């Protein structure tokens, strides 16, 4: 087979970015089944870029030190809630995933300029990689806080967080804090 997890279709992926697809793309022969191939992607600049999105996003689950390096839990926790998402939504655990991340990544940030600038900042464009990495962390942080002292468990916060991100709702922590940072930047333009 060539499908993700043997159930997720590989052929109905959409461009959906025209020319930003080069950094969010799962359509090649390297798109493997189980997102677990050790940590050889963080060894050189943009050798992470050729990695498929599913792999990096399941990698970004292990935070807080208590669950550091528990990639088995991460792949199980992604397989669960993937077998859920499409189910509750209906599309393709993939297409929904790319749409959710694209909707959860900021596009404009604020940076200080000059040798001694200490009063004002300036608006700057955000590169694909930076926003995607940040968005994945936001999604993971939202899942963690929906699983922290809350009635919801792991491998389930991710599903509804991704559904909200695809929907564009303010329920998800990701896009709501994206909007907060965007408002800060807009006041800082």
């Amino acid at each position: 087979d060539i499908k993700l997890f043997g159930k997720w279709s590989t052929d109905d992926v959409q461009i959906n970015d025209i020319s930003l697809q080069d950094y969010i793309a799962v359509k090649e022969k390297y798109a493997k089944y189980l997102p677990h191939s050790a940590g050889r992607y963080a060894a050189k600049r943009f050798r992470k870029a050729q990695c498929p999105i599913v792999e990096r996003l399941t990698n970004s689950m292990m935070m807080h030190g208590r669950n550091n390096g528990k990639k088995l839990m991460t792949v199980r926790i992604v397989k669960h809630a993937f077998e859920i998402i499409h189910l509750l939504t209906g599309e393709n655990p993939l297409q929904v995933l790319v749409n959710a991340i694209i909707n959860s990544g900021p596009r404009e940030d604020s940076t200080r300029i000059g040798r001694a600038g200490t009063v004002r900042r300036q608006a700057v464009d955000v590169s694909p990689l930076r926003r995607v990495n940040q968005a994945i962390w936001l999604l993971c942080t939202g899942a963690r806080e929906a699983a922290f002292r809350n009635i919801k468990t792991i491998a389930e916060c991710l599903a509804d967080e991704l559904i909200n991100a695809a929907k564009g709702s303010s329920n998800s922590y990701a896009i709501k804090k994206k909007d907060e940072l965007e408002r800060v930047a807009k006041s800082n333009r």
């Binding site: 020319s19 930003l20 950094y23 596009r107 300029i113 700057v124 955000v126 930076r130």
Partner: protein, 62 residues
């Protein structure tokens, strides 16, 4: 606030207080007759595309 794409043609340099911005020249697709200078935040590449929220704004050059 329209959003448009422009192709990177020459990565001019790296600036910023501690250094976080890449100043780069981008040529628009739909015109190809006008190019601008933008400081993109985050790891950027050569020949890729960048999403700008404002086309009338340019960062400091040199």
């Amino acid at each position: 606030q329209p959003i448009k794409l422009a192709r990177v043609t020459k990565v001019l340099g790296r600036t910023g207080s501690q250094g976080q911005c890449t100043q780069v020249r981008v040529e628009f697709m739909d015109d190809t007759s006008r190019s601008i200078i933008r400081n993109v935040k985050g790891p950027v590449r050569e020949g890729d595309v960048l999403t700008l929220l404002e086309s009338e704004r340019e960062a400091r050059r040199l």
